[PDB]
């Protein structure tokens, strides 16, 4: 690289809602992150949050 003009790219430690993210190798060490994904919330470990009327009215 052209010595001078680049960002410094030191190893970092980064966080998320889960445990720490390890590798991190980044400009500006020690950043926080609202959502990283290895969760088993959020789409990895899938999980949710026609259907209704045949239940509620069925006898009533």
């Amino acid at each position: 690289m052209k010595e001078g003009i680049h960002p410094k790219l030191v190893p970092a430690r980064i966080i998320c809602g889960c445990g720490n993210v390890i590798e991190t190798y980044s400009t500006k060490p020690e950043i926080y992150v609202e959502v990283c994904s290895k969760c088993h919330p959020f789409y990895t470990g899938q999980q949710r949050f026609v259907e209704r009327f045949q239940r509620r009215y069925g006898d009533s």
Binding site: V50, E51, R52, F53, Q54, R56, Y57, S60
Partner: protein
Amino acid sequence: PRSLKKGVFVDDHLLEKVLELNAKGEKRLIKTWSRRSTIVPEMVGHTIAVYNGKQHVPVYITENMVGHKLGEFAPTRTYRGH
């Protein structure tokens, strides 16, 4: 809407030709005037001829017609833009 626990309401002169078909073995065309009536699970698959004010409209019934009164699907006036 319809008070829950009081129905739900299907005009029983209509229900009387569907539990007369779905739990019969005969299953074919029907032609009503009762749009005030709620719906299946026991009519879904039949073909009811609904009334608009002027004549009898055909509707096929599916599971996404969850609890819609029978006139939600046979509208009452004509526009066609211009």
